[PDB]
Every structure is written in C-alpha cells, then in structure tokens.
Amino acid sequence: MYEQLKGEWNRKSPNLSKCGEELGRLKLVLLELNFLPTTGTKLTKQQLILARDILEIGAQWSILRKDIPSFERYMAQLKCYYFDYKEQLPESAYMHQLLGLNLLFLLSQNRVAEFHTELERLPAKDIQTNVYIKHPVSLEQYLMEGSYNKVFLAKGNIPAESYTFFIDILLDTIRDEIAGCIEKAYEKILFTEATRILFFNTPKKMTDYAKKRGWVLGPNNYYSFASQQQKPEDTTIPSTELAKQVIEYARQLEMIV
Amino acid sequence: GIISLLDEDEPQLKEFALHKLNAVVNDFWAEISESVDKIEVLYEDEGFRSRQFAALVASKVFYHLGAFEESLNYALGAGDLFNVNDNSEYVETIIAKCIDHYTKQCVENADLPEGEKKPIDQRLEGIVNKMFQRCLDDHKYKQAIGIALETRR
Amino acid sequence: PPPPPAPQDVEMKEEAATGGGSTGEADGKTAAAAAEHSQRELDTVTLEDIKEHVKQLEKAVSGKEPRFVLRALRMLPSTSRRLNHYVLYKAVQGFFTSNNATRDFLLPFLEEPMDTEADLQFRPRTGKAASTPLLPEVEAYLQLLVVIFMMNSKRYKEAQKISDDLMQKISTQNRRALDLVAAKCYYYHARVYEFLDKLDVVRSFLHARLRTATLRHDADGQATLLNLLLRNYLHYSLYDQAEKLVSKSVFPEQANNNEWARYLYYTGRIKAIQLEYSEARRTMTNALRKAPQHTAVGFKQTVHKLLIVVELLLGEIPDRLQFRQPSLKRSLMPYFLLTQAVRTGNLAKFNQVLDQFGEKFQADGTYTLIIRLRHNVIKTGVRMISLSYSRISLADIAQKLQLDSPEDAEFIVAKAIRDGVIEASINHEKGYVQSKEMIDIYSTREPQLAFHQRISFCLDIHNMSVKAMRFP
Amino acid sequence: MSEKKQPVDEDNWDDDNVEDDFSNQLRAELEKHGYKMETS
Numbered sequence: 074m075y076e077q078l079k080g081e082w083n084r085k086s087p088n089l090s091k092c093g094e095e096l097g098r099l100k101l102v103l104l105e106l107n108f109l110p111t112t113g114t115k116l117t118k119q120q121l122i123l124a125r126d127i128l129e130i131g132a133q134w135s136i137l138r139k140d141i142p143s144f145e146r147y148m149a150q151l152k153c154y155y156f157d158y159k160e161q162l163p164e165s166a167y168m169h170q171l172l173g174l175n176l177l178f179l180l181s182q183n184r185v186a187e188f189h190t191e192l193e194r195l196p197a198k199d200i201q202t203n204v205y206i207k208h209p210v211s212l213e214q215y216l217m218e219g220s221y222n223k224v225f226l227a228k229g230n231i232p233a234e235s236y237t238f239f240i241d242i243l244l245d246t247i248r249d250e251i252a253g254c255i256e257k258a259y260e261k262i263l264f265t266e267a268t269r270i271l272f273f274n275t276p277k278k279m280t281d282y283a284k285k286r287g288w289v290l291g292p293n294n295y296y297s298f299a300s301q302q303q304k305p306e307d308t309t310i311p312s313t314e315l316a317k318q319v320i321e322y323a324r325q326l327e328m329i330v
Numbered sequence: 331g332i333i334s335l336l337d338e339d340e341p342q343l344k345e346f347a348l349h350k351l352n353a354v355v356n357d358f359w360a361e362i363s364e365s366v367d368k369i370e371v372l373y374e375d376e377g378f379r380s381r382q383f384a385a386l387v388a389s390k391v392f393y394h395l396g397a398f399e400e401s402l403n404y405a406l407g408a409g410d411l412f413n414v415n416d417n418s419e420y421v422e423t424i425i426a427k428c429i430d431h432y433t434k435q436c437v438e439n440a441d442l443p444e445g446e447k448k449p450i451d452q453r454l455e456g457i458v459n460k461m462f463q464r465c466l467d468d469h470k471y472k473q474a475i476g477i478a479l480e481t482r483r
Numbered sequence: 484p485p486p487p488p489a490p491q492d493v494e495m496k497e498e499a500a501t502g503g504g505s506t507g508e509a510d511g512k513t514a515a516a517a518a519e520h521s522q523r524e525l526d527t528v529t530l531e532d533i534k535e536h537v538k539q540l541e542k543a544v545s546g547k548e549p550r551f552v553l554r555a556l557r558m559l560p561s562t563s564r565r566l567n568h569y570v571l572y573k574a575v576q577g578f579f580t581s582n583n584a585t586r587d588f589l590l591p592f593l594e595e596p597m598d599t600e601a602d603l604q605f606r607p608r609t610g611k612a613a614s615t616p617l618l619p620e621v622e623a624y625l626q627l628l629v630v631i632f633m634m635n636s637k638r639y640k641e642a643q644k645i646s647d648d649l650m651q652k653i654s655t656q657n658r659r660a661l662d663l664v665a666a667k668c669y670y671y672h673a674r675v676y677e678f679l680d681k682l683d684v685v686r687s688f689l690h691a692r693l694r695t696a697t698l699r700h701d702a703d704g705q706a707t708l709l710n711l712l713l714r715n716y717l718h719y720s721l722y723d724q725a726e727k728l729v730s731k732s733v734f735p736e737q738a739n740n741n742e743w744a745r746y747l748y749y750t751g752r753i754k755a756i757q758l759e760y761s762e763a764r765r766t767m768t769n770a771l772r773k774a775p776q777h778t779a780v781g782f783k784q785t786v787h788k789l790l791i792v793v794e795l796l797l798g799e800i801p802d803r804l805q806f807r808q809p810s811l812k813r814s815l816m817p818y819f820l821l822t823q824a825v826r827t828g829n830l831a832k833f834n835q836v837l838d839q840f841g842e843k844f845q846a847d848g849t850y851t852l853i854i855r856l857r858h859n860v861i862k863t864g865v866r867m868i869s870l871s872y873s874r875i876s877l878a879d880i881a882q883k884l885q886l887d888s889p890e891d892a893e894f895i896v897a898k899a900i901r902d903g904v905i906e907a908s909i910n911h912e913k914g915y916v917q918s919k920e921m922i923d924i925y926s927t928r929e930p931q932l933a934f935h936q937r938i939s940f941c942l943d944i945h946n947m948s949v950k951a952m953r954f955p
Numbered sequence: 956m957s958e959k960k961q962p963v964d965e966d967n968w969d970d971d972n973v974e975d976d977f978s979n980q981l982r983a984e985l986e987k988h989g990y991k992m993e994t995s
Contacts, residue, residue: 107346109332110353142337149331158683186757189851193721193756196850214854218861219894258900260911269890311928318935325939329946356690360726394694395730418649419695533958779957801968823976826969 074120078102078127085133092134099124099131108157115159122163125154129167136174136235148175170205170234177209180216181242188213205233221247221270252282256297264293332358333365341378348380351387362391373407382409393420402428406453413456425457432458433480440482487546487576490537494547495569497527501611502555503566505660509605513656521607521660528618528667536619538585546576548616549584552592557603586620586632593617593639606650607660613639614664621671624678633675640668641688648695662696662703666739673711677718686715706735706742713749724753744773748786755793756851763793784811788818789847795825796855798863802826817843825856828864828884833857862902865895869905873920877909889914 081087081095108121128150135143151171154162165171176191192199192210199206208227215223224247231240251270256262271279282288289296308314332350336343355362362369369391372384385407392401405412405424415421432454439447458477465473505520512518531537537547550572554565575581584592596602596612617636623629647661658665669692676682689711696704716723727733727750737743748770755763767790774783787806794800802822807815817840824836837844837853844850861884868880877892886892893914896907907918967974974982981988 103343103346107349109346110349145334146337149334152331153335189756189758190721192851192854196848210854214857217858217898219891219898221894254897254901257897258906258908260908260917262911266911315932322935322939325942329942329949356687357723359690360723360729363729364725396697396732419691423699532956780961782956799965801965801970802972804968804971819972822969823972826965826973827976 075102078120078123081127081130085130086137089138092131092138095131099128109153113159115161118159125151125162125165128154129165129171132167132171132174133235136238139238144174144178148178167234169203170236173203173205173209173233173236174239176206177236177239177243180209180213181239181246183246248278252286255282256295256301259297259301261291262295264295267295332361333368336368341380344372344378344380348383348387351383355387355390359391359394362387363395366391373404382407382411385409386412389424390420393424398424398427402431406451409453410456412453413460428454429458436481436483484542484577487541487543488573490535490541490547491573491576493527493530493534494537494551495566497524498551498569498611498615499566500524501527501615502608506603506605506608509607509657509660513659516659518660521663524611524615525663525667531619532622536622538619539623543576543581545583545585545588546581548589548619549582549592550575552589552612552616553595554599555596555602555608556600557608558600586629589616589632589636604651605655606646606657609646609650610643610661610664613643614668618668618671621668621675624675626678630675630678633671633678637668637672637675640672644688644692644695654699656700656702658696658700658704659702662700662707666703666707666742669707669711673715681719682715689715701735703735703738706733706737706739706746709733710742710746710749713746713753717749717752721756724757727753740773741775744770744775745786747773748790752789756849760793760797764797767791767793780808781811784808785814788815789849792847792849792852795822796852796859798825798859798866800825825859826863828860830857830860830885833860861895862899862904865899866904869899869907870920874918875916877914877916 078098080098081092086092102120102124106117106121108118108124111117111121128147132144132147132151135147148171151165151167154165155168172191172195176188179187179191195206199210201207212223212227224243228240231237248271255267255270267279268274271282273279283290283295287298289298332347336347350358351362366388369384369388372378373381373388375381378384385404386409388404389401389408392398392404401424405428412421413425435448462474462477465471465476500520501524505518505524508518508520516522535541538545551569554568556562556565591598593613593616597609602608613636617639620629620636621633624633643661643665647658647665651657669689672685673682673689676685689708693705693708693712696702696708712726716726733746733750735743747766751763751766751770754766771787771790774787777783784806787803788811791800791803800822802819803815804819807819812819817836820836821840824832833856844852864884865880868875877889877896881887881889881892881895886895893909896909896916899905900907905918906921907916909915910917
C-alpha cells in the first residue's frame with residue numbers, strides 16, 4: 074500500500090529537492106494519516122513504522138543538509154515516535170544514536186537541564202551498552218573532569234554515522250570557551266600555551282583572538298589587559314545608597330507596630 | 331516537543347498539531363505554555379484560517395495559566411462556536427467573566443454620555459440573546475429583567 | 484463480640500459530630516471555617532488509619548455499612564430517633580448473626596440515604612456518605628475482589644467530584660469540608676489507580692479537577708492536586724516539570740502544614756533532579772526543619788535517605804547516624820558506606836561501593852549522583868586543600884591526588900576559578916600555582932548589609948505576629 | 956503510618972565516620988610516626 078513513499082530509499086542524495094519531492098510524498102502521508110493522534114489497530118501504524126524508519130532517514134538528510142530546524146523537527150518526530158502510547162513498536166534501528174545526536178547537539182549547544190532529563194528518560198541502556206550514548210556521557214564527564222585532550226582521544230573514532238558536524242561544533246565549544254578561559258584569573262601566557270590549549274599552531278583565528286576581544290599581544294607574550302580586571306571600586310561610596318535603604322526601610326518600620 | 335513539529339508554514343500541519351491539541355492538551359499544559367508567542371503568530375496570521383482555534387486553545391492555556399483578560403481577548407477571537415456550548419467548568423465561567431465585562435462595560439458606558447464607547451466586538455451578545463431566550467422561554471423574566479438591570483439601558 | 488462495640492461506639496461518635504455536628508457547622512457557618520468537625524473528622528480519619536477502620540474483619544463480617552447508611556432523612560426533630568435507630572441496631576452484632584453486606588451490596592447502599600428521602604441540601608453529607616463507608620475499604624489491597632471495589636467505590640467518588648462541582652447551584656463553600664476529604668481520598672485514587680498501572684485519564688481527572696478549584700474555591704484543592712500532579716510526573720518520566728517553571732502558582736495559605744512541608748520536599752526533588760545545589764539543599768533544609776514530628780517511623784527516614792543526596796553531591800556532608808533508625812541501619816548499609824566512600828578520596832572504593840550496591844542505587848534511581856560524584860571528589864579535595872594553603876603548587880595537590888600531569892591540574896584550577904572557589908592563579912611557566920588564601924577580605928559593613936535581611940526578615944515575622952493576632 | 960508496638964517509644968560527622976574508621980590507628984602519634992626516622 075502506497076509504494077511511492079519508498080522513492081528515496083537507499084541512495085540518500087541524488088539531490089536536495091528530490092528529497093523535497095519526498096517531503097511532498099511525506100506531506101501526503103501527513104494529509105492522509107498523522108500518526109500521533111492515531112490511537113491503535115497497529116496495521117495502520119505499520120506504514121507509520123515505515124514513517125519512523127524514513128524519518129530517521131530524513132534525520133540523516135537533516136544532518137546531511139546541515140539544517141538545524143529540520144534536525145530539531147525530525148528529531149522531535151523521533152521523540153514523539155517513542156512518546157506515542159503504542160510504545161509496543163518494532164525495534165527502531167537508529168535508536169542508539171539518534172538520542173546520541175541530539176545529546177551531542179546538546180553538547181553542541183551547552184544545555185544544563187536537558188542533559189539530565191536525557192539521563193532520566195532512558196537510564197538503563199547508558200552504562201551497559203550503546204556506545205553512541207555510553208561514549209558521549211562518560212566523555213561528557215571527562216569534559217567537565219578537565220580534559221580537553223579526551224576530545225582528541227575521543228575523535229579517534231567519533232564519525233558515528235555523521236557525528237562529524239557535531240564534533241566540529243564540539244571544537245567550536247572548545248575554542249570559544251578558550252576565548253573565555255585563556256586568561257580568566259591568570260597572570261599571562263606565552264605562545265606555547267596557545268600551542269597547547271589552542272591548536273592548529275597559528276591560524277589567523279588565534280591572531281583574530283589577539284585582535285577580536287581587545288587583546289594585548291605581547292612580544293611572545295599575552296595579556297587580557299594591563300590589569301585584567303579594569304579597576305574595581307564600583308562606587309567608592311557604599312554609604313548613600315544604604316541611606317536609601319534607610320529611606321524605604323525606615324518607612325517599613327513605620328505603618329507597622 | 332510538539333510545537334517544534336511546526337516549522338512548515340502551511341496551516342495544514344497546524345491542523346494536525348491542533349489534532350494533537352484536542353487530545354492531549356491537559357497533559358501538555360506545560361508544553362503549550364511556552365508555545366504562546368507562536369500561538370500569537372497563529373493569531374496574527376490571517377492566512378492561518380484556524381485562528382479561531384488559536385484563540386480557543388489560547389484561552390484554554392490562558393484559562394489554565396490564569397490569564398483572564400487575555401482569555402477574554404481570545405475568548406472574543408474564538409468565533410461563533412464559543413457561546414453555543416454548555417460546559418459547566420470552562421465556557422460558562424469565561425462567559426460569566428465575559429458578560430461581567432459586558433455589564434461593567436454597560437455601567438462604564440452608561441456613565442459615558444453620548445457614545446464614544448468601546449464597541450460590541452464581533453463575538454459578544456451570543457449567550458445574551460441565547461441564554462436570555464432560555465430565560466424568556468423559562469417564562470421567568472426575573473432573569474430577563476436581570477440583564478435589564480445589568481445594562482442600565 | 485465484645486470488641487465490635489468499640490467500632491460501634493467510635494463510628495457513632497464520628498458521624499455524630501461529623502454528620503449532625505459538622506452539618507450543623509455547615510448550615511449557616513464558616514465565614515472562613517467554623518466547621519471544626521471537618522478537621523475533627525479528619526482526625527478520626529487518622530484514627531481509622533491508626534486503628535482498623537471499622538469492619539475490615541472485627542471478629543465478624545460487614546456490620547456497620549449495611550446498618551448506618553440508611554435513614555438520616557433530615558426531617559422534623561424526631562430524627563434524633565433515626566440516630567436511635569442507628570444505635571439500637573447493635574444487637575445484630577451482639578446477639579444476632581452478622582452477615583456479608585459490604586463490597587457487593589454497597590452499590591445500592593450508597594444510593595440508600597438518597598433513597599430514604601431527598602435527605603438534605605449540603606454535599607458534605609453526600610461525600611461523607613461516599614467516603615466514610617468507602618474509605619474503610621481502600622486499605623485492604625490484597626488485589627483480589629477488593630481493588631476493583633476500591634476502583635468502583637472511587638468511581639462513586641468520581642461521582643463525588645460530579646456531586647462536588649455541580650452542587651449548590653454554585654459557590655457554597657463546602658470544598659472547605661470536601662477538599663479536606665478530597666485531599667486524602669484523591670491520593671488514595673492515585674494509590675489504587677497506581678496499585679496496578681500508571682494512570683493516564685486520571686491525569687485528566689486530576690487536570691480538570693485542578694481547573695475547578697481555580698478561583699471560585701482556591702481552598703485546599705490546588706496544593707493537594709498539585710501534589711498528585713507532581714508525584715504523577717515524578718513517578719513517570721521527566722517531561723512536564725517546566726509546568727511550575729511557567730505556571731508557578733503553588734502558594735496557598737499552606738494550611739495543612741505537612742502538605743507544604745513534603746510538597747516543598749517534592750519540588751526540592753524536582754529542582755534537585757533538574758540541576759541545583761543551593762536552592763535544592765536549602766529546601767531540603769526547609770522541608771527538613773518542617774518535618775512535623777517523630778510520629779510516623781520510616782516516612783521521614785527513607786525520605787531523608789533521599790533528602791541529603793544533593794548534600795552528598797556537595798562534598799560537605801556529615802554522616803547521618805543520629806538520623807539513623809537502627810531499622811534503617813540495615814537499609815543504610817550501602818548508604819553509611821556510600822558517604823564513607825564520599826569522604827574517602829579513594830577511587831577503587833568509589834567504584835567499589837557503586838559496584839557493590841548499584842542495585843540499591845537503582846532503588847535510589849537517581850544516578851545523577853554518580854555522574855557528578857567523582858567530580859564531587861575532586862571538588863572536595865580542591866576545596867579542602869585550596870582552603871588550606873595560600874600558595875600551594877599544582878604538583879603538590881596533583882601527584883598527591885593522582886593527577887600525573889600538570890596540565891589537567893591547570894584545567895582543575897581553571898574550572899575551579901570558573902566555579903569560583905578560590906582566586907588561585909598560576910606562576911605561569913609550566914604550572915606551579917602561585918596563589919593566595921583570602922582573609923583581610925572584609926568583616927564590618929558586610930554583616931550589617933546582611934542585617935537588612937536578618938531584620939527585614941524579622942519585621943516580616945513581626946507582621947506575621949500581628950496577623951497572628953488577627954485570629955481570635 | 957504508626958501501626959505497631961512503637962507508641963511507647965559537614966561539621967564533624969563525615970569525620971566522625973572516618974575518625975571512627977581509623978579507630979585504633981595512627982592519625983597523629985608524633986613521637987612514633989616522626990622519630991622512627993633516626994632510631995636506626
């Protein structure tokens with residue numbers, strides 16, 4: 074039934090708009106069925122088992138076409154596919170790493186509480202197996218343990234069905250955090266610390282780092298500023314605003330008893 | 331994540347999300363409450379022809395969020411299927427507050443000489459001339475004189 | 484036959500003050516709450532939870548519920564003779580033979596005081612009539628011809644929601660009795676509906692039940708139904724916890740004074756499991772100091788085994804041996820040893836206790852502990868040693884705490900500055916921290932800055948005493 | 956639920972446990988752990 078849905082099955086990139094022709098075909102699947110309010114009788118859901126599989130393959134297209142609204146859109150499809158109250162489904166193929174994808178995308182976008190509901194929704198399959206989950210979570214512990222070189226040890230085998238864009242944005246969340254943590258409370262560094270913490274010896278990106286943030290490129294030397302803190306005294310008068318506290322506070326002592 | 335399944339700008343996928351709205355809105359009252367601005371996008375878009383429903387579940391999640399003047403604004407935007415219902419929890423309360431707004435509006439405009447009023451918006455008066463007909467056809471015109479008290483008109 | 488006179492007596496003492504007493508306290512009363520027999524009747528609910536309720540067995544079967552459910556009538560003042568009909572039927576258990584007319588014959592019995600007459604106007608007689616017989620039945624869940632009658636009897640309590648939102652042609656304030664019952668029994672709802680499976684449409688029952696207590700009776704509903712919603716989303720996975728993050732309306736008068744305690748404990752578990760140390764541990768602290776008494780064993784003990792887990796994740800935690808019930812001791816055998824593994828800096832012990840009791844940690848079910856607990860080891864070490872020495876080297880702390888290299892120690896110092904514990908810099912050649920402690924920091928104005936909040940907090944409590952004077 | 960026989964019935968804690976873990980140990984013991992050096 075409705076065989077033309079399988080028109081983009083195994084080749085995965087003739088074009089970008091032939092996949093949009095497949096978006097028209099999937100749009101016909103939308104006009105005809107709409108899996109999510111579909112209650113039961115799981116033979117009207119078997120072509121929706123196909124829709125689960127080919128919207129995994131649409132997620133493969135979204136990471137292929139670099140589209141982040143389409144990645145969160147099809148990723149939210151895959152989220153709603155497991156949410157659907159007929160959870161009694163055939164075993165989803167990319168289930169081990171699609172959760173990884175968003176998670177590493179989470180690791181791309183620096184979440185703080187979605188990480189732990191990622192730890193909450195399927196905890197039991199994280200320690201025992203599923204290196205697409207087991208590797209980014211102990212890896213993510215090792216990021217917040219203090220190893221930026223566990224990145225490069227991890228990237229020895231991190232393709233992981235196109236986990237290349239996300240590890241490039243992982244390199245981004247290395248380098249802009251270096252743009253935070255290169256002189257945070259530091260004395261100074263020298264060029265070899267920009268060889269260690271930064272990499273790729275010298276691009277015009279670290280020369281940009283010397284010319285983007287208001288940087289003192291010392292002669293083989295490095296400074297945030299001449300003072301790094303920009304003269305903190307903030308008022309030099311802490312007293313009069315506390316007399317404003319005496320204004321409203323003393324008013325608060327009145328009207329009550 | 332049921333509103334991030336709406337990057338398509340045609341209203342026909344908003345129909346299927348709305349499909350989800352008539353089913354699991356109560357489980358998703360958290361989820362809908364961040365969607366509000368996009369619901370605003372659904373109300374500002376005139377090409378979105380289900381904007382009546384945008385004002386419906388707008389005033390549902392605002393009814394749950396305790397917005398009531400905005401449940402009044404999108405209670406007005408809900409359309410004609412608004413007044414006809416006989417629900418004992420939602421709709422009779424928001425027409426109790428809507429017609430509370432009508433009667434304080436008629437007190438305010440009863441104190442406002444020679445027009446310059448806030449107009450009867452296009453979804454007023456429905457249960458006025460409907461439940462009023464229930465009270466005329468109750469043959470107990472104490473309610474029917476009740477509205478006449480309530481309007482000062 | 485000599486013990487069943489005690490439920491015969493206390494039963495009549497319940498519906499005396501409750502039925503005639505609180506109905507007389509409900510006719511025209513309760514400017515806020517003059518129905519003291521509401522709370523008295525709830526104290527007899529606690530009495531029925533301490534004792535056997537009435538006729539679970541009581542040396543017989545099914546005596547009081549076929550007896551007392553009839554003949555109230557609310558009529559001419561010979562309806563004290565209907566109470567005499569209630570009293571003088573007690574020669575059936577004493578002299579006659581007792582018979583089985585509960586859990587099967589209750590289905591018309593619940594209609595019977597409604598089928599005596601149009602009995603009376605107020606709905607607490609009806610919720611009394613579908614609670615005070617039926618709440619003695621909910622505590623025998625041997626899952627065999629007793630949980631389907633909890634099920635159906637609480638379908639009659641769904642008809643008490645139906646006979647709650649649709650009674651008194653709207654807004655006689657008997658919710659200030661009935662939500663006083665519809666707190667407790669609704670928890671029993673989410674007990675028995677979750678004695679078997681997750682409830683999914685009772686979610687919606689709970690939803691619209693929250694919506695009916697929105698503004699017209701914002702009294703005891705919203706917080707208790709809020710607890711049912713919270714433990715619903717808590718027993719289920721973590722998806723709908725942004726609700727309070729956007730619909731933070733969680734603040735009643737906090738009347739029940741234990742509801743607010745364990746409620747703030749529950750959202751303490753919520754903010755705990757999201758990510759939080761400080762606010763989480765201080766409502767662990769606030770709910771902990773609002774723990775009512777030691778009048779229920781274990782229910783503070785296990786909940787306090789779960790209370791200080793974020794403080795286990797602080798690194799600054801003492802070992803709970805005075806909290807330790809010796810009955811909890813055999814259940815805190817991993818847990819004593821868990822915080823033993825916390826304060827010890829050993830790693831083979833750190834994975835050895837996890838290895839030893841990962842099953843009890845599954846009974847905990849809160850493995851955000853272990854993802855940041857090694858992190859808590861290095862933060863406790865850097866907090867202790869960074870607290871100790873002004874200018875330590877990173878090689879000193881590093882190859883003592885087995886760090887084996889200077890650069891990850893520089894990453895520890897970097898993320899310690901980022902986490903903001905000490906203002907430790909580095910004598911930047913190859914590591915070898917140059918740093919400081921922080922004293923002569925300040926001590927004089929900065930306390931009287933805090934005294935604005937101490938004593939503005941005091942005047943808060945002052946006006947709590949003036950409004951406390953507003954009571955009599 | 957109190958339905959039984961019963962109705963008749965870091966500061967220095969985490970350190971009272973480690974300090975009760977080394978109970979007969981040599982946490983301090985100067986003249987012992989300090990002058991075993993030059994005894995031989």
